[PDB]
């Protein structure tokens, strides 16, 4: 699992943590560097948790289709990193699982590959790499969970519940606009049925 607190802070990550701190009324911090601020450290942990959770759900922008994972030539092992939020097959039923930190073919009962495998993969990205609407949803969900766990204010709980639903709605609008999905000619099955 990637360490959230071991790299330099970005401006957006500084903004996100302070937004989470604001949810319970904590004043903003100038830096995420260790100042013994338990609240800021807790907020960053929840920010990382929510960042991993929403990305792992799967969206057109972050789902990578047709990605090749190359094996080591001498060990024939493909690493299944903890930053692989989702690893699927390109079509049909998926055959690859995680076994000991390496890719395992459950149908062939083998973890040895002579060549790269093509998978539909979600790889963890920085919160800085998220779209603006997705950043807002991550912060809103992190703020809601932060208040529930470390303050518990029931009035704050209700408003952040509504804010997250609105934040998730606008992320769904982004995903549909980004996807540009068509059930007539963008459809795997129906587009073939349209040929005359």
């Amino acid at each position: 699992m990637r360490s959230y607190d071991m790299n330099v802070e970005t401006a957006a990550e500084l903004s996100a943590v302070n937004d989470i701190l604001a949810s319970i009324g904590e004043p903003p911090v100038s830096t995420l560097e260790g100042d013994a601020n338990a609240d800021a450290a807790n907020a960053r942990r929840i920010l990382n948790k929510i960042n991993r959770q929403i990305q792992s759900r799967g969206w057109t922008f972050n789902i990578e289709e047709g990605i090749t994972l190359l094996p080591d030539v001498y060990s024939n092992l493909i690493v299944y990193s903890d930053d692989y939020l989702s690893l699927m097959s390109t079509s049909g039923q998926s055959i690859y699982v995680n076994r000991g930190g390496y890719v395992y073919d459950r149908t062939s009962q083998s973890d040895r590959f002579d060549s790269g495998i093509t998978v539909n993969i979600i790889r963890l990205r920085d919160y800085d790499e998220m779209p603006e609407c997705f950043r807002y949803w991550i912060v809103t969900k992190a703020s809601r969970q932060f208040n529930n766990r470390f303050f518990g204010a029931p009035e704050v709980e209700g408003v952040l519940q509504e804010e997250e639903d609105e934040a998730r709605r606008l992320c769904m609008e982004y995903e549909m606009d980004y996807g540009g999905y068509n059930m007539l000619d963008g459809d795997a099955f129906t587009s073939g049925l349209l040929t005359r």
Binding site: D5, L70, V73, S75, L77
Partner: protein, 141 residues
């Protein structure tokens, strides 16, 4: 057994992105070398790039036509130069304690992964030379 600090991938002449599975503390600790007739080490900003923290993007595609069958990604953590040095006046911080612990772990782990630089047993019951010559064997009988 299986080396986690040295990753080598087949070079097909058209793929320029290679994954970094192992942890590292600095981008200079990652060493990119092309293996083939010779072992050519690449430069940080003219021969490749860190596209992401886990991906190395080669500027040019290399393959058997160029004389390089494989590309190797290897962590080489500094042993003489430590990233964290504590002073009698400094505030003790979690990040400094983490980096000091992790750097020693990488040095220890790189030492435990030296079957790459020798002849060691691979996943199978075979001693692996890992694509280099056993020079100076000379006469045999």
């Amino acid at each position: 057994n299986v080396i986690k600090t040295v990753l080598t991938y087949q070079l097909d002449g058209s793929n320029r992105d290679f994954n970094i599975p192992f942890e590292y503390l600095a981008r200079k600790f990652v060493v990119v070398t092309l293996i083939g007739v010779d072992r050519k080490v690449l430069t940080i900003n003219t021969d490749y790039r860190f596209a992401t923290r886990t991906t190395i993007s080669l500027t040019k595609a290399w393959g058997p036509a160029d004389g390089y069958t494989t590309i190797e990604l290897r962590r080489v953590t500094s042993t003489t130069d430590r990233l964290v040095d504590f002073t009698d006046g400094s505030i003790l911080r979690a990040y400094d304690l983490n980096v000091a612990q992790i750097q020693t772990m990488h040095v220890a782990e790189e030492a435990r992964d030296l079957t790459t630089d020798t002849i060691g047993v691979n996943n199978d019951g075979h001693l692996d030379a890992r694509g280099r010559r056993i020079v100076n064997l000379a006469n045999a009988v």
